[PDB]
Write a protein that binds this ligand. Structure first.
Ligand SMILES: Cc1cc2nc3c(=O)[nH]c(=O)nc-3n(C[C@H](O)[C@H](O)[C@H](O)COP(=O)(O)O)c2cc1C
Ligand code: SF4
Lengths: 71, 429
């Protein structure tokens, strides 16, 4: 058998049997990423301290002015 | 030397074509039963010795050296009456050389029964006529009744002191029953199924009694071998192979005929001289099955200079069986012819052993596919391997006789098989 299970009309020979099974497409798949691409594009060490400290300087001035208005 | 030329005074089987009377008053004129009393009186050892010296080989497919075969029979009789079964039955495809001895000079066959019987210490001869040879065994029973009435056979061998009687058995249409170890059984009354060789017929054959199975042509040339010269007989053919085989040019020759002619004859010479010629000239030849049907093909490129003797045809990757040369010309479908041969071996295979019983139906199926082209280019190597699985393993040589036609067809005409397969492939799609 095995030439009556995989017919492929013609083929003249036991080789050239159909042989259609699963696999990667011709040319493989896309290059798959595996590294750790963690983007560190956030606020830096400064700009975070200077945003906080700018607030505990202007916002505290505003607390002061609000205390003046309340008084 | 250069063989082939056999003069009409050297042909052993005179009245082959039945032109003259076959029976007595017509056989004594041809030298039959001439002085067999002296021969029987010359003894058994002298007969065996002259048969061995004459180098007579088996006229049947086996090709065994006769005489040496007759020396296998026991000398001192231990109560088992040594028999002598004559293998009249042929049934080989192509072979009619037996059919021209059973009729048309059967008295040579009866005198050979007697001379081989005294030769191998026998006590009775069972001429196993092929079943279909009804007219032939009727002629032979007529000649047997004659040789009984003429005191030749029975209770005194031609007036001598030898008690020897010839009984005529006849099978019924079975090529397998013709085999040496199956003749004994098909004559013992059982089915025509061969027995294994470890008990040899010379040791325990017919009825368990010793016996030797001889083709009619070997037993029938025995008389004239002894009455003429064993040196004269061995003066024909090549060194080892010697004698005058009775050929049967079977098919696709413009004048098919069975004609006795010296062995070691060039196959081309035989064809061109006696049977006329390959239909449409020698250049029209396609293949030739030189022996019976139990022998591979000859593809016409090694058939020009091949000699019809056992040794050369064996050296050409073939065999000289009953020398029933089957000729096939460029007009035949050689694969269909070998497919019908394999069908024959499927039909006439007593089925006793598995390698032949099954693999021969298998060979027939694969051949009836490849003759259309329904196979695959690698099956031609399965077919070779299937045949080599059948060949050495079967009980008798019928396994051989069924693997050899297909093996020869492959070995020689593999281009034609592959061409049919590729043409089937291109016919699809
Ligand atoms: C495959 C096969 C085919 C045979 N064909 C024949 C045959 O056609 N004629 C015959 O007389 N014996 C035939 N025999 C029997 C023996 O092979 C052999 O021919 C016979 O027993 C003795 O013949 P011989 O004394 O001339 O060798 C055949 C045997 C086998 C195994
Ligand atoms: S199967 Fe073949 S070899 Fe075996 S006994 Fe039958 S014919 Fe002979």
């Amino acid at each position: 058998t095995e030439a009556m299970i995989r017919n492929k009309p013609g083929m003249a020979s036991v080789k050239d049997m159909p042989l259609l099974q699963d696999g990667p497409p011709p040319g493989g798949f896309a290059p798959v990423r595996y590294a750790r691409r963690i983007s560190n594009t956030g606020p830096s060490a400064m700009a975070m301290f200077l945003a906080v400290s700018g607030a505990f300087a202007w916002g505290m001035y505003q607390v002061g002015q609000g205390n003046k208005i309340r008084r | 030397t250069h063989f082939g030329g056999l003069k009409d005074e050297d042909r052993i089987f005179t009245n082959l074509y039945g032109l003259h009377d076959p029976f007595l008053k017509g056989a004594m004129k041809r030298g039959d039963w001439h002085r067999t009393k002296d021969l029987v009186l010359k003894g058994t050892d002298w007969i065996v010795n002259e048969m061995k010296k004459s180098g007579l080989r088996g006229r049947g497919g086996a090709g065994f050296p006769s005489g040496l075969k007759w020396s296998f029979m026991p000398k001192v009789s231990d109560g088992r009456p040594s028999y002598l079964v004559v293998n009249a039955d042929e049934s080989e495809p192509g072979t009619c050389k037996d059919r021209e001895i059973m009729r048309h000079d059967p008295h040579k066959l009866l005198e050979g029964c007697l001379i081989a019987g005294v030769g191998m210490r026998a006590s009775a001869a069972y001429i196993y006529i092929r079943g279909e040879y009804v007219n032939e065994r009727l002629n032979l029973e007529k000649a047997r009744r004659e040789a009984y009435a003429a005191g030749l056979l029975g209770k005194n061998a031609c007036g001598s002191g030898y008690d020897f009687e010839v009984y005529i058995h006849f099978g019924a249409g079975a090529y397998i029953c013709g085999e040496e170890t199956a003749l004994l059984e098909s004559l013992e009354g059982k089915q025509g199924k061969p027995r294994l060789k470890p008990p040899f017929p010379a040791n325990a054959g017919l009825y368990g009694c010793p016996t030797t199975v001889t083709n009619v042509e070997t037993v029938a040339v025995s008389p004239t071998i002894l009455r003429r010269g064993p040196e004269w007989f061995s003066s024909f053919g090549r060194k080892n192979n010697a004698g005058t085989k009775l050929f049967c040019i079977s098919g696709h020759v413009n004048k098919p005929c069975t004609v006795e002619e010296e062995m070691s004859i060039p196959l081309k010479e035989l064809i061109e001289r006696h049977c006329g010629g390959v239909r449409g000239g020698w250049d029209n030849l396609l293949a030739i099955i030189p022996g019976g049907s139990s022998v591979p093909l000859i593809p016409k490129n090694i058939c020009e200079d091949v000699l019809m003797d056992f040794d050369a045809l064996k050296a050409v990757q073939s065999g000289l069986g009953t020398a029933a040369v089957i000729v096939m010309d460029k007009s035949t479908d050689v694969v269909d012819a070998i497919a019908r041969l394999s069908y024959f071996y499927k039909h006439e295979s007593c089925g006793q052993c598995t390698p032949c019983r099954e693999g021969t139906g298998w060979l027939w199926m694969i051949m009836e596919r490849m003759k259309v082209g329904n196979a695959k280019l690698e099956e031609i190597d399965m077919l070779q391997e299937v045949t080599k699985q059948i060949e050495g393993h079967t009980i008798c040589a019928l396994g051989d006789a069924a693997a050899w036609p297909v093996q020869g067809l492959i070995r020689h005409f593999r281009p034609e098989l592959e061409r049919r397969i590729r043409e089937r492939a291109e016919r699809e799609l």
